[PDB]
Design a protein around this ligand. Structure first.
Ligand SMILES: [Ca+2]
Length: 311
């Protein structure tokens, strides 16, 4: 699709869709959900050159509700999008700790470096400093650690002696009776590579006769538990993590639309095809069927256009 692209006609379609009295929402869906993010940026530039207004600001004014949130989300470049989500998680009343955990645990070091740069450019403060001020306790420690390198950019070579020592230390940390040693869990889970951690989880099972997930579930609670389990799930299979995130955004009463939007939008050009496959395998139904059950209107139709064919 990106073999060679003139954005001008698409910009004109959007102009006609919003100009005057009445809004053609379907024409907005047909352009923005069928073009790539980079093509959208070209469309935005053409729109401003031709018509003198910023496309995103125009979209924010012309549209409302969930449909507006989704369409505007599509207009953010990668990394800047996550920076906006993280800012929104902290700037309001309360902290949306779940948003922060998801992004920090599921992104790679190099992705996080880009998100950190975008966050400082757009909001004039350091992401790490804002997290330090807005969170506390052990949650604060793991989140800061995930940003503070927490690298791997790995090999396939794991040090077997260190993997065994890490597993021994995790076991010992769980076994202390007047307070789990949370810092030992945090350091190993946040500073070791994914490949090393997979071996640690294997060794931990042999030593402890308990899965690492069940140990975390019995030894921790609340946000710290969520954060640890998220690191574990992302290490084992990232695509499966995102499927589960989407499932729980929709399961039961109501919808966590913020979570649905963010995960579909941010994964749309990376692994949404694998997420769809994993969703089917894990839950015995398609992603689209749950979206159809939980959402309505132009919002629903835009989500389904993005997801694409889902037999
Ligand atoms: Ca629901």
């Amino acid at each position: 699709s990106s073999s060679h692209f003139n954005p001008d006609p698409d910009a004109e379609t959007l102009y006609k869709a919003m100009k005057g009295i009445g809004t053609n929402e379907q024409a907005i869906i047909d352009v923005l959900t069928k073009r790539s993010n980079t093509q959208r940026q070209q469309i935005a530039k053409s729109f401003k050159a031709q018509f003198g207004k910023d496309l995103t600001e125009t979209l924010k004014s012309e549209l409302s509700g969930k449909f507006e949130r989704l369409i505007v989300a599509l207009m953010y470049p990668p990394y800047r999008y996550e920076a906006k989500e993280l800012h929104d998680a902290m700037k309001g009343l309360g902290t949306k700790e779940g948003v922060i955990i998801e992004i920090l645990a599921s992104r790679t070091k190099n992705q996080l470096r880009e998100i950190m740069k975008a966050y400082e450019e757009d909001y004039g403060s350091s992401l790490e400093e804002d997290i330090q001020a807005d969170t506390s306790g052990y949650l604060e420690r793991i989140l800061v650690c995930l940003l503070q390198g927490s690298r791997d950019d790995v090999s396939s070579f794991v040090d077997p002696a260190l993997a065994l020592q890490d597993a021994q230390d995790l076991y010992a940390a769980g076994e202390k009776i007047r307070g789990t040693d949370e810092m030992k869990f945090i350091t190993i889970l946040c500073t070791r590579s994914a490949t090393h951690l997979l071996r640690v989880f294997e060794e931990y099972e042999k030593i402890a006769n308990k899965s690492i997930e069940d140990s975390i579930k019995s030894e921790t609670h609340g946000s710290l538990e969520e954060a640890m389990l998220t690191v574990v799930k992302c290490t084992q299979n990232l695509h499966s993590y995102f499927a589960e995130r989407l499932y729980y955004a929709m399961k039961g009463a109501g919808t966590r639309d913020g979570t649905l939007i963010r995960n579909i939008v941010s994964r749309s050009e990376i692994d949404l095809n694998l997420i769809k496959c994993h969703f089917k395998k894990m839950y015995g139904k398609t992603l689209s069927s749950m979206i159809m059950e939980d959402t309505s209107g132009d919002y629903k139709n835009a989500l389904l256009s993005l997801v694409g064919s889902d037999p």
